[model samples]
Target: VLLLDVTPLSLGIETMGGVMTTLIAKNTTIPTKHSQVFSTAEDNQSAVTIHVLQGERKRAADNKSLGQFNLDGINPAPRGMPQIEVTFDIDADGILHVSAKDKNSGKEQKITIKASSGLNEDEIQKMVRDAEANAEADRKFEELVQTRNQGDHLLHSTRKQVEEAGDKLPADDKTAIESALTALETALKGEDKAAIEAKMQELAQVSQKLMEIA
Candidate 1:
């Protein structure tokens, strides 16, 4: 269900040449209306200028002129006799719309003004995408650690068992077997996969060396 007073805007009038008289300020309760009355400068002042302004300035010149409207055919009454009526409205997003009624003559004019803030739709969408990408990368890293640790544990146990068995091993076979173990230990201290795999391949080539030694 749509409600009232979502948009809000500031509005005021030019007063005393340069000063601004506020009719409505930002966040003022909305879906509502207010009327202000003013008089003319001189008798038979056939025309009157309504200066519509916006912003928080205390002076008319310091605020923004949203628009200027003129009312004509004023009655030939004494000075300060022409009565002008102003009405301001605000919507849910805080946007302001305004209207003026020459109450005595039943004449009116209106306009709407809008100001917006906060994050836009695109920024929110991008943030959600980045979060998903980070989660996937972390999951892959966890799986890699599990696989590598299992392989390392099995290799350590296999080497120790083969070495402890006493047998009349051939000289070349014994030498190859010892070299593979020493290389594997070196691989454990170093950083690269190429170095570690090179040592593991040495153990493979000496498979028969294990036969004669064990």
Candidate 2:
């Protein structure tokens, strides 16, 4: 069975006193939702801005800013009088969806969590081909890192052996080894895996001369 993952942090909206009133607590299961009623802070306020945040901090400023938007068409009234309902939903893919509705005017506004994750279902489907291309690119990157590390290890051993041998080896072989080491070092600094491997082989061939001298 594939156990679904829960949200890693708490999600809430900024309320009066700049506090984060949590709609869904941390570790809540995915594809879940929670709603709460809010009100205007002052009398005759036109609309209220819903600021969504995610973190463990009590103060909204200290948490991660998800997004915010103004919920308009509110029925003008006294402070704490208008009933504004805010809803938060976490989809199965761990995406957030928020909606704010005015109970009095029935005006509703919503903002989907987008910029933070940058990988919403709609976007993924839109760039499906590019996503596949990215996977292949990622695999190539992993191979490059592995090859570079191997070349680095070979270079280190070559340096150690060259130091230990001192002037005992022939001058011509010593010069070739030194040149190969420089080329290998330069190639390892770059992303050309084949070039690095070629330089590694060159160094290995020159290092074999040391065996003969020994």
Candidate 3:
């Protein structure tokens, strides 16, 4: 008998809280199906952007954003009222099929993984070996690079959030966020990875505080 393989990475979608909502977990036998329910965050919202991600990170911004699609034609309702059901089906060949449905109207949208990640199965294994080496200095350097990329993604999302909040959010808060963002951007341009990481943490703190105030 032939044994089925499992998924290599955790698969998830970005939720309203800026966190990853895992559907298909890592190492589960393939040719599987799993799903989760989500809802709108604001009243009368007609659509939601479902960003597909992969990684072991808790934060959506820290993970690899595979792709995004809008779940539209949702019935207008108050926040946390409408139910949007999302499904994930990974076939034996390792292809992912994602679908979102409106429980009320039965309307649905389906998307397949179109763009490949460039590396094939063999190249993926080779890269995994390199990662497992984990030399002290090399590991630290890789962390720095990963943190910098996370910072970049965070900055982009934060800008969009601040813009959407607009005049409703305090002017002082906006100024502080923009200042921190600028500093981080400058740090990214420099060769000092440590400095970039410092700025990244600083920006993360500012965003956390903003979330609390909201």
Best by TM-score: 3
Worst 10 residues of 2 by lDDT: 118-127
lDDT of each: 0.59, 0.78, 0.74
List where candidate 3 sits over 4 angstroms from the true fold. 1-4, 114-214
Give the per-residue lDDT of model 2 (tens digit) for 10-49: 7889875456678998668888999999888765787999
Please, what are the lDDT tens digits per residue for candidate 1 over residues 1-214?
A: 4654432334677753345667876446656556788776544666677777755444456446767777776666655676777776666555657676665677667666664432234643453454355556434433433333433543554465465654545567667766777777667555454666677677667756454444
Preferred candidate (lDDT higher): 1 or 3:
3
TM-score of 1: 0.45
**Candidate 2 local distance difference test against the native:** 0.78
Tens digits of per-residue lDDT, candidate 3, 82-183, equal: 789999888878788889998977778878874353245664465445445534545455555666666666677678778778787788888888899999
Clashes, model 1: 13
> What is the overall TM-score of model 2 with all chains considered together?
0.53
